[PDB]
Design a binder for this molecule. Structure first.
Ligand SMILES: [Cl-]
Ligand SMILES: [Cl-]
Length: 213
């Protein structure tokens, strides 16, 4: 009867969102201007572009419109599998509207998405769904490993891809760094995949709640 949200998740405060967003843009700018990235364009890009500078801020030309957020369960108002089952959980109802701190441990880039890796607490892990299509468990990774904040997408890429891209990146790391940015060391995982491991983890303030289209 009562339909569900479009999605549950942690929605960053405008201030925490602005901070993480600005940091993301700096990372794209710095990465795109880095020697290691420039010498590896052929694996990142597909065909016909000459070899001058690619501006990643232009490349990831689809950014989240509202405040940045870390999605837990996409529900589509109940049209998604497991939506009703996730929403009715006691812990989700308990946590609804409450404040959390999300720890960001890294920022990554692939030819499809740019994002930030979220490291969920044991408390927050209770709010992670257990029936996602391709869960960490069917892949030999800790549950909630795909938790993330999308910063940008390529033109024909849907934002769901960001989580998939992270899972793949976290399989590779299961190699010496090729560079050093002001906030951390840069890794090149091949196939246009790049990861910046922050020397000090970013902490953003967010509210666990439900979003409606
Ligand atoms: Cl923002
Ligand atoms: Cl609270």
């Amino acid at each position: 009867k009562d339909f569900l949200p479009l999605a549950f998740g942690w929605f960053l405060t405008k201030k925490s969102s602005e901070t993480l967003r600005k940091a993301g843009q700096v990372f794209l700018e710095e990465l795109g201007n880095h020697k290691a990235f420039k010498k590896e364009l052929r694996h990142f890009i597909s065909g016909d572009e000459p070899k001058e500078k690619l501006e990643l801020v232009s490349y990831f030309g689809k950014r989240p419109p509202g405040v940045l957020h870390c999605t837990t369960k996409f529900c589509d108002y109940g049209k998604a599998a497991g939506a009703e089952e996730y929403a009715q959980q006691e812990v989700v109802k308990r946590s609804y509207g409450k404040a959390f701190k999300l720890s960001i441990s890294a920022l990554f880039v692939t030819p499809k998405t740019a994002g930030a890796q979220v490291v969920l607490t044991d408390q927050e892990l209770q709010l992670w769904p257990s029936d996602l299509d391709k869960p960490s468990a069917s892949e030999g990774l800790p549950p909630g490993s795909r938790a993330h904040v999308t910063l940008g997408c390529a033109a024909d890429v849907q934002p769901v891809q960001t989580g998939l891209d992270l899972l793949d990146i976290l399989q590779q790391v299961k190699g010496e760094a090729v560079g050093e940015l002001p906030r951390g060391k840069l890794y090149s995982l091949g196939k246009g995949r790049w990861m910046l491991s922050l020397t000090k983890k970013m902490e953003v303030k967010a509210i666990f709640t439900g979003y409606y289209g």
